[PDB]
């Protein structure tokens, strides 16, 4: 099935129908008037952030044995992994860019829905996810609520309830236990037969849309275009 899309639901409606039961939804009409939606382009990103050092994940998926993490400038990242026919997949993933570069923080807004949480606003973490077409974040689950805001490009996203965890074959080690052993888009059904029948939601997340990923919901993400998303991690 597809993730439902709602236009600016009330706080109460979001709390009662999505946050408390732990059900995904796409919020429309909320982030579409972030300044980022019209300002962020490669040129603007280079102007404001190009000289700054960022961590870059290199490799198809963080579960790959070739995968590694390095450091470079934002200008270098764009040159090597976006604009010039890249040799390998690079991803400026899970980085607190807005703490590093407060000028860019002015182009976004924390969703008012986060105030329904039991945590402090000062404890919300804001992460950038910026990369070329084809980045893949393998199926995993996170320990907080998430609003994933799409600014540039589109992402294909697959969501599996925590009720389906047994069909997702989590890694057995403590370090990887919140990551699935399965490749969502080409699963080894000989090794992982229960995966095939596990129900899920999916969507293509487009610019200006916010996906609510409930705490512990399993998610898999593939960028369909040059993409920039902003996540808000909250409780
Ligand atoms: O956007 C991606 O590639 C992956 N995102 C996440 O896992 C997240 O926001 O928690
Ligand atoms: Mn995640």
Residue numbers in the entry: 182 to 416
Paper text:
JMJD5 is a JmjC domain-containing protein, present in both the nucleus and the cytoplasm. Building from an extensive peptide-based screen for potential JMJD5 substrates, our results provide evidence that JMJD5 is a JmjC-hydroxylase, catalysing the stereoselective C-3 hydroxylation of arginyl residues in sequences from proteins involved in chromatin stability (RCCD1) and translation (RPS6). Consistent with previous reports, JMJD5 residues 174–416 fold into mixed helical and β-strand topology comprising seven α-helices, 13 β-strands and 3 310 helices. Like most 2OG-oxygenases, the JMJD5 active site contains a metal centre, which is octahedrally coordinated by an HXD..H motif (H321 and D323/βII, H400/βVII), the 2OG oxalyl group and a water molecule, which is likely replaced by a dioxygen during catalysis.
We therefore pursued a site-specific 'disulphide enzyme-substrate cross-linking' strategy, which enabled us to obtain four structures of JMJD5(Q275C).Mn.NOG.RPS6(A138C), JMJD5(N308C).Mn.NOG.RCCD1, JMJD5(N308C).Mn. OG.RCCD1 and JMJD5(W414C).Mn.NOG.RCCD1 as cross-linked complexes (Complexes 2–5, respectively). In these structures, clear electron density was observed for the substrate backbones that enabled modelling of residues other than the target arginine (RPS6 aa 137–138 and RCCD1 aa 139–142). Compared to Complex 1, single sidechain conformations for the target arginine residues corresponding to 'productive' (A in Complex 1) and 'non-productive' (B in Complex 1) orientations were observed in Complexes 3/4 and 2/5, respectively.
